[PDB]
Subunit: 179 residues, 4 copies
Amino acid sequence: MQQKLENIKFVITDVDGVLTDGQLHYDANGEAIKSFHVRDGLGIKMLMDADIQVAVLSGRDSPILRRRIADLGIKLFFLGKLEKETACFDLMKQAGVTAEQTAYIGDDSVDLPAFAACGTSFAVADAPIYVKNAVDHVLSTHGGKGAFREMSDMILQAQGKSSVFDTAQGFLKSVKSMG
Amino acid sequence: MQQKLENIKFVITDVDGVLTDGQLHYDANGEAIKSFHVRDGLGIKMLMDADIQVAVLSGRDSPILRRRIADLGIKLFFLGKLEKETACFDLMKQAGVTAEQTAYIGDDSVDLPAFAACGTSFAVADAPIYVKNAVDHVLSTHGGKGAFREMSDMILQAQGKSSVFDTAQGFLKSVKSMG
Amino acid sequence: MQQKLENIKFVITDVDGVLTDGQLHYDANGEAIKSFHVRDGLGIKMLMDADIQVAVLSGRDSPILRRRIADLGIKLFFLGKLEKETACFDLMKQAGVTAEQTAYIGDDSVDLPAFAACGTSFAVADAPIYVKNAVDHVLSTHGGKGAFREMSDMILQAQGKSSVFDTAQGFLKSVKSMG
Amino acid sequence: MQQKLENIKFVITDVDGVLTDGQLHYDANGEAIKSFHVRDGLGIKMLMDADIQVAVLSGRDSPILRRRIADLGIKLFFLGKLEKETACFDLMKQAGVTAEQTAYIGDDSVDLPAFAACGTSFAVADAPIYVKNAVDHVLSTHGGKGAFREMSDMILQAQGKSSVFDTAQGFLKSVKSMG
Ligand SMILES: O=C(O)[C@@]1(O)C[C@@H](O)[C@@H](O)[C@@H]([C@H](O)CO)O1
Ligand SMILES: O=C(O)[C@@]1(O)C[C@@H](O)[C@@H](O)[C@@H]([C@H](O)CO)O1
Ligand SMILES: O=C(O)[C@@]1(O)C[C@@H](O)[C@@H](O)[C@@H]([C@H](O)CO)O1
Ligand SMILES: O=C(O)[C@@]1(O)C[C@@H](O)[C@@H](O)[C@@H]([C@H](O)CO)O1
C-alpha cells in the first residue's frame, strides 16, 4: 500500500455505511437524523490540512448531510448520485488531481464503479465479500466507527505526516485547521 | 437451500428486529424514529428489479414505517397485524404467487405463524432458539445490520442473478431501478 | 433457579440499562428519545397474560417513559425514585403479592436495595461485578438487547407456560393480549 | 495506579468518544441528539459526593451538552476548546487543586495535550494506539459504554470509598447526592 498511499492528494468518501454505520434514521418525513463519527471528522480536517482534498459521493441527499459537509469545510461533492464512475472523474477534475492520486472508500455494490475509477480503493470492515474483493485494502474498522480515520491515519503516516495525530506538538501546530 | 431459493418470486419481511435491530425509539407521542439499514434497502431494490416482489408484514404501524415503505417502492403490506398466518396468505394472493414461491424472514414468536404459511423461512442471527428451530435457514447477520441483504444476496445468487451486486457492470445496468 | 422461578407472580424492572442499553439521548431540553427493545415488549405482554404482573421502577422520570409504559399496558410503577427498597415493598403491596413471589431485574448500584427487597434478582449481562455478585441469576443478554425477554422466557418456561412463545399455536391463543 | 489514584481530587473528562461513543447525531441544524451513558452519570455523582470535583473539556459546544452538564450538577467546564493544555491548567486553578491531583480521560489526538497537563491520564478502550501509548491507564470499556464509570469506580476504590457503589447501605447513605 505504501507506494500508492504516498501519492494520494484526493480522497472521495461514500456516506452511508462508511461515515455512518449504515443506519437510516427515519421519521415521518424521511431521514431525520444522520450519525457521523467524531474521530472521522478530525481525520477529515487532518487530511485537508496536509494538502489532501476530501470529497463526498453519496447516492442519497439530505439537508442533514449537507449540514455535516458544511461543518467539516468540505467543498467538492455530488449527492443523490447512484452512477458513481462518471461522478468520481468529475470530482477529480474539480480537485485538479489524477486517478492515481485519488483514493475512494466505500461499503456496497454502488461503490464498485468508484473503485474502478480511482487508483486506490478501501473497504470498511463490515463490507460484503464482493466489495472486499474489489478494493486494494480492507480496513479493520466497521463503517461509522472510525473507518475513515483509520484510512486517513494510514495515508498521512505513509506520507510522513503522522505528527499531526500522534504527538501533542504536531496536533498543536495545525490546531487552527482542526475546528 | 438451493432448490427452494431457486423458485422464490416473493419475499415477505417483518420490520422490528429484522429491518431494524429491535430498538423502538420513543418520544412523548410514541415511536419517533425508526432505524433501517442502507444495504438492506439496496437489497430490496435488487430483488424487485430481478422480478421478485417484496412485502412488509408488521405487528406495529407508524407514519415513519409507511414513509420508508414509500421510499423503497414497496406496494404490498399489512401493518399493525399480529396474526400473521392469514396475513401471509392474503399477501401471496395479491402478489400472484404460491406459498412455495414465498420466503419470509422474522425474529420472534409473532413470526412463527408466518414461518408456517410460507415455503421458505429465514431467521436473523440474534433470533431466539425457538425461532431458529422453526426456520429453514438461520442467517449469520444480526437484525437491522444487513440480515435482509444477506438473504436477498442468497436468493439472487441461487437464481443466477448475482451480477447486479457483485460486478460494477451488473449494478450499472439496473441502476435506474436502484433509487 | 427453578424453585424460585416457579412461584413468581410479580416482576419489577429498572429502565435505564435494562429495558434500554444505558444510553440517555439528550436534546436541549433533556431526554428526547428513549430506546426500548421490541422483544422485551412482547415478553412483558406474555408475562401479564400468564398472570404475572409487571411493574417499572426507575430513578428517572420522563413523558417518554410514561408513554412506553402506557403502550405496554403497565399499571404499577414509581418513577424518579432513587431509594428503591421502600419502593419495591410498596409495589408488592399494590400487586397483592409477597417478596418471595417477586422478581427484580437491574444493572447498577441503585438497584442493590431492590435486590435485597425482592426474593429473586436478575442482573443484565453488562452489569458491573458488584451488581452481578448481588443477584440470584446473571443473564447472558446485554441490557436493552432482550435481557428482559430472556428473563421472562425463563420464568414462563419454569412455570410450564412456554407455549405462548415457542409454538405458533400457543402464541395464536393469547394473540389478543399481545398488542 | 494505586499511588496516583489515591491522590486524585479532580477529574476532567472529554465528551465525544468518552461520555459518548463518538457518534454525532446531526439534523439539518447540526447536532440534534447527544447520547450519554446512565452508569457514567451515576459515577459522576459518586465522585462529586466523595469530594472529587468533575469537569468537562470539549472541542465542541452545544445547548444539548450544556443541558447534560446542568443535569449532572457539573460546575467547571470549557466548551468549543480545541487547545486543551491551557484549558486543563485553568480548570485546575478553578478547582483549587494541582496537576498531580488531577486525572483526565480522553480518546483522540486532541486529548494528547490534556494528557501532558494532568498527572494521571486514562484512555477509553476504543482509543487509537497513539492515544493508548500516551496515557497512564487504558480502560477495558469502550467510550460511551461506561468507560467513565469504570474509571470513577477505580478512583473511589483506590481511596477506600467503594461502599457507595458496591453495597446497598453505602449507596443508601449518599442517596440525596445521587439525583
Ligand atoms: O465534528 C467532528 O467530527 C470533529 O472531529 C471535528 C473536529 O472539528 C473537532 O472539532 C472534534 C472535536 O471538536 C475535538 O474534541 O470534532
Ligand atoms: O435507502 C436505502 O436503503 C438505499 O439502499 C436505497 C437505495 O435506493 C439506494 O439509494 C442506497 C444508496 O442511495 C446508495 O448509495 O440507499
Ligand atoms: O412494542 C413492543 O415492544 C411489542 O413487542 C409489543 C407488542 O405489543 C407487539 O406489538 C410487537 C410487535 O408488534 C410484534 O410484531 O411489539
Ligand atoms: O442521568 C444519569 O446518568 C444518572 O446516572 C444520573 C443519576 O442522577 C441517576 O439519576 C441515575 C438513575 O436515575 C438511577 O436509576 O441517572
